[PDB]
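> forwarded from #structure-qc
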């Protein structure tokens, strides 16, 4: 049940956990406090599980995108770095660890897609997407391809799609507006249209996946590809003389890839919050701390200004950071599951022809059904959490009333309104009226449903701001 007087850290298996342990030994040498570095399986699944029951590590390292949900569940403590410390990291990274105006984690590393090119086939990579079709024709005459990347996952096509105005969910002071999704707008349309055309004009195949693209580039068959730092080691052994640079612009605007920020959050149940802060602020987030982690497993670009300036001496890291600063921070909320599923479908259908670009990106029944599912999942999660506390502990009197009410309102809303909304959506999807709910009608109902979800969300926050008190 989280021991006091020490620190236990969880970090993923693909990170530099040995170097982290190195920093850990140094902390123990100066303070006498031991630091244990573990890397269990599916820790992103385990953390919330064990954390909800007062257990788990003092510190958890993980992509920032999962932390919004954790904070919403009351699993992370609010961190307290001062103005001087925050000034040591790039501003944009702090925006990735905010939940309802509060800081819930320390940014460590930054990751984003970049344009990777074969210096032998293309010494001067294109600066715009618009000049790629012409470049492809020139290369095709030589049997080569201009560009090949994974068109199956929205993560990979998003940069182009979001370039001229697209975005997932609107962001405001550590809060994402689920009623404001930026997939159905002029910019997102222009982007998917350019991509669609590339496929039509034989410049790309709708079936190109991650492996096909990786194979084509590593075998010198295509002058460029779009991929992340995780693919660099494979290219290094291919011996292809490559370079990494800023993604091409579209309609004059920067491509906007999603940004993932590896972060360190402090377990709300941790009795060692002050030790964790000391360790994170003065031992890990230092040139020496990050250097040790990086030598064990490259972190890519880092959030610490002083050390990134150093790491950026490497053009590839420089490119990653450049693309990351022009990108979109991945929303740190569970409803992104709906976004991923919908956008993927939209692209798949739009590329082939199953639907036009407008129909594909239109927010109809399909989108809302996916969003509703996402809301059901988080709310049911909160209820199980709270009824488990009432079921375990005693905490009689007041708190029980607050729990029953919070849970009661959520379950009714789901058993009643969620049920109705789901049917309205399926009707919207049926061409033969009833009357036929309009996309706008769905939007209106959804915006109303979100008002209710937010209120309930507040009561649960109200409860967490205590625990089982």
């Amino acid at each position: 049940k989280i021991e006091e007087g020490k620190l236990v850290i969880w970090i993923n298996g693909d990170k530099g956990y040995n170097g982290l342990a190195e920093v850990g030994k140094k902390f123990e040498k100066d303070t006498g406090i031991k630091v244990t570095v573990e890397h269990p399986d599916k820790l992103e699944e385990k953390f919330p599980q064990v954390a909800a029951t007062g257990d788990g590590p003092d510190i958890i390292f993980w992509a920032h995108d999962r932390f919004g949900g954790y904070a919403q569940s009351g699993l992370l403590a609010e961190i307290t770095p001062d103005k001087a410390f925050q000034d040591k990291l790039y501003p944009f990274t702090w925006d990735a660890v905010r939940y309802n105006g509060k800081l819930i984690a320390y940014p460590i590393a930054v990751e984003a897609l970049s344009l990777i090119y074969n210096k032998d086939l293309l010494p001067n990579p294109p600066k715009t997407w618009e000049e790629i079709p012409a470049l492809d024709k020139e290369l095709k005459a030589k049997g080569k391809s201009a560009l090949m990347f994974n068109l199956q996952e929205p993560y990979f096509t998003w940069p182009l799609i979001a370039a001229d105005g697209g975005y997932a969910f609107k962001y405001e002071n550590g809060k994402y507006d689920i009623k404001d999704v930026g997939v159905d707008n002029a910019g997102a349309k222009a982007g998917l249209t350019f991509l669609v055309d590339l496929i039509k004009n034989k410049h790309m195949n709708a079936d190109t996946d991650y492996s096909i693209a990786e194979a084509a580039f590593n075998k010198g068959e295509t002058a460029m590809t779009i991929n992340g730092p995780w693919a660099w080691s494979n290219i290094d052994t291919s011996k292809v003389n490559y370079g990494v640079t800023v993604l091409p612009t579209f309609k004059g605007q920067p491509s906007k890839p999603f940004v993932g920020v590896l972060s360190a959050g402090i377990n709300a149940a941790s009795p060692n919050k002050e030790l964790a802060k000391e360790f994170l602020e003065n031992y890990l987030l230092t040139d020496e701390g990050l250097e040790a982690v990086n030598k064990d497993k490259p972190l890519g670009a880092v959030a610490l200004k002083s050390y990134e300036e150093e790491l950026a001496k490497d053009p590839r890291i420089a490119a990653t950071m450049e693309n990351a600063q022009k990108g979109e921070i991945m929303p740190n909320i569970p409803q992104m599951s709906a976004f991923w599923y919908a956008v993927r479908t939209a692209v798949i259908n739009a590329a082939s022809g199953r639907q036009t670009v407008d129909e594909a990106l239109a927010m109809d029944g399909h989108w809302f059904l996916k969003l509703l599912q996402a809301e059901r999942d988080r709310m049911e999660g909160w209820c199980k959490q709270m009824e488990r506390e009432e079921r375990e502990n005693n905490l009689p009197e007041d708190i029980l009333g607050k729990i029953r009410t919070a849970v009661g309102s959520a379950q009714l809303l789901m058993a009643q309104k969620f049920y109705q909304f789901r049917e309205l959506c399926e009707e919207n999807l049926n061409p033969n009226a009833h009357p036929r709910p309009t996309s706008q009608d769905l939007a209106g109902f959804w915006d109303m449903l979100q008002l209710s979800i937010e209120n309930i969300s507040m009561k649960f926050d109200e409860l967490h701001q205590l625990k089982a008190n």
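QC bot note: The first strand starts at residue 7 and ends at 10. Residues 398-428 form the longest helix (31 residues).
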